[PDB]
Amino acid sequence: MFIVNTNVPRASVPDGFLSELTQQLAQATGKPPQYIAVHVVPDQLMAFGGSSEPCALCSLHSIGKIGGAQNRSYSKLLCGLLAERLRISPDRVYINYYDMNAANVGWNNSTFA
Amino acid sequence: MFIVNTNVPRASVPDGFLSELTQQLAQATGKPPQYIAVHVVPDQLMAFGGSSEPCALCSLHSIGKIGGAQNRSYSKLLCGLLAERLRISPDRVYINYYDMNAANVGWNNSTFA
Amino acid sequence: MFIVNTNVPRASVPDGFLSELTQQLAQATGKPPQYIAVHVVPDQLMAFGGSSEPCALCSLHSIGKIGGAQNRSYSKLLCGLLAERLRISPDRVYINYYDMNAANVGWNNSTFA
């Protein structure tokens, strides 16, 4: 599950963006794309280092596939995509990574445990 | 605290939905309804498995009352409600469960510790 | 990173609020304001304890600077601000505090590790 909150306006989010995220996250995490969920929230009231220049606050939740090297690799990918598609500088992006226990993720009337 | 983000439109969220979630969560968690917070965010730009068919990304935070069996039960309850009231398929819902330490939840100028 | 979700309408958020939050959080956390991110989301569909008087659901993520006494101090400051500026009663504010590992925070194409 990847969520991006940004002050970039909705009209600046290119068509195809959610599919591009889905695809690249599936490749990066090694997870099947059927399990990948993405959520983009434009037009937000936000600031980064006191400034309202384009920025993004993001989260990536996964059951495993979270760790030092893997998170570095995710950040390079995701900042790269935010720069190329939303014109957000990578140094105005935070991404919180969460390694979820399977018992703590609900789906399809039960959990993954 | 229960949060639902969904691509279902605002008009499709029935009047009374926040009160129903409040009541059912109070019953499920055993907590008084005065402590239950609910937040529904419709009209979102999101996808699940690459698809923009109705879906939901949710979170349930609680000080205790989180665990393997309890979270299975919550997921049956909450996917049931999202299916009945918002017409979302349970297999397009993720719920992240968070067992919060009392010291890490702020309220009324202090924390719950 | 501080996020506030509230039912208070956008027109009730005073000019300067994101700067005030940035400033006061820099002071409270001891971190330079260049590293502080803030995000205010008004006009939400939310209830707290069964009712829809002004309320807020918030999160504060930090690499360290999270703990029992510190979090009590943050709650005093942030509930104070939300009361003074948004007219939200402190007993209708929840703030979830997250102590993030540096390896689990992405920024500038890498992590903080």
Side-chain angles (χ1 to χ4, degrees), chain A residues 1-9 11-33 35-83 85-86 88-113, chain B residues 1-9 11-14 16-22 24-26 28-44 46-64 66-75 77-83 85-86 88-113, chain C residues 1-9 11-71 73-75 77-83 85-86 88-113:
Chain A
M1 175 188 323
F2 177 65
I3 307 159
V4 48
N5 303 273
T6 181
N7 55 355
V8 167
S12 301
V13 177
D15 288 350
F17 190 54
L18 294 184
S19 295
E20 185 175 31
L21 291 169
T22 303
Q23 290 172 348
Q24 297 310 125
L25 284 163
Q27 304 190 298
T29 59
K31 299 262 186 181
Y35 289 99
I36 297 299
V38 299
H39 179 195
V40 176
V41 192
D43 295 292
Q44 298 300 288
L45 181 59
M46 43 167 68
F48 189 111
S51 162
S52 61
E53 297 290 343
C55 58
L57 305 176
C58 308
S59 317
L60 178 70
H61 296 72
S62 180
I63 298 169
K65 311 304 301 192
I66 298 290
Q70 293 174 99
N71 298 351
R72 285 187 281 278
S73 185
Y74 302 144
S75 299
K76 185 190 172 176
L77 167 71
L78 296 162
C79 289
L81 284 169
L82 293 171
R85 308 296 185 204
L86 303 191
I88 302 171
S89 185
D91 66 0
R92 294 181 65 65
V93 177
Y94 288 151
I95 306 168
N96 292 139
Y97 295 103
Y98 300 98
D99 186 355
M100 300 301 291
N101 195 284
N104 288 338
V105 181
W107 172 68
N108 198 24
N109 301 303
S110 189
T111 70
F112 288 104
Chain B
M1 174 179 348
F2 177 68
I3 307 159
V4 48
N5 304 274
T6 182
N7 54 353
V8 167
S12 300
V13 178
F17 188 54
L18 291 187
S19 293
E20 186 174 31
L21 286 169
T22 299
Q24 292 289 309
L25 281 163
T29 61
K31 305 254 192 180
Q34 291 85 359
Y35 286 85
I36 299 303
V38 296
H39 177 195
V40 178
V41 192
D43 294 292
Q44 299 305 99
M46 45 172 62
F48 190 117
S51 159
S52 60
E53 297 291 338
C55 58
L57 305 177
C58 310
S59 56
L60 178 65
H61 295 75
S62 180
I63 301 165
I66 299 289
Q70 292 171 99
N71 296 351
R72 286 189 281 281
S73 178
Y74 297 143
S75 301
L77 166 71
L78 292 162
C79 290
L81 283 167
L82 293 171
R85 305 298 185 203
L86 300 190
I88 304 169
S89 183
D91 70 353
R92 295 182 62 66
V93 175
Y94 283 148
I95 305 168
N96 291 142
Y97 296 105
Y98 300 95
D99 186 358
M100 297 303 290
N101 293 345
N104 290 332
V105 182
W107 175 67
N108 192 46
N109 294 299
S110 188
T111 69
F112 284 101
Chain C
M1 195 195 329
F2 178 67
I3 308 159
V4 185
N5 303 272
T6 178
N7 55 351
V8 168
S12 302
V13 181
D15 293 348
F17 188 56
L18 293 188
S19 300
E20 189 175 30
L21 287 171
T22 301
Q23 293 169 350
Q24 295 298 302
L25 283 164
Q27 302 253 268
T29 61
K31 303 253 193 181
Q34 293 93 338
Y35 286 88
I36 297 301
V38 298
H39 177 191
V40 177
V41 192
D43 292 290
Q44 295 302 289
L45 179 60
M46 43 174 62
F48 190 110
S51 70
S52 277
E53 296 89 5
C55 63
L57 308 177
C58 308
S59 320
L60 179 69
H61 295 78
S62 181
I63 300 165
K65 309 305 300 192
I66 298 289
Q70 290 174 100
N71 296 348
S73 183
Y74 300 148
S75 299
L77 165 72
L78 293 163
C79 288
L81 285 168
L82 290 173
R85 310 295 185 205
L86 300 190
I88 303 173
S89 182
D91 67 358
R92 293 182 62 72
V93 176
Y94 284 152
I95 308 166
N96 287 140
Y97 292 103
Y98 299 92
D99 184 359
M100 299 302 293
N101 292 341
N104 289 340
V105 181
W107 173 70
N108 197 41
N109 303 303
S110 188
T111 69
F112 283 105

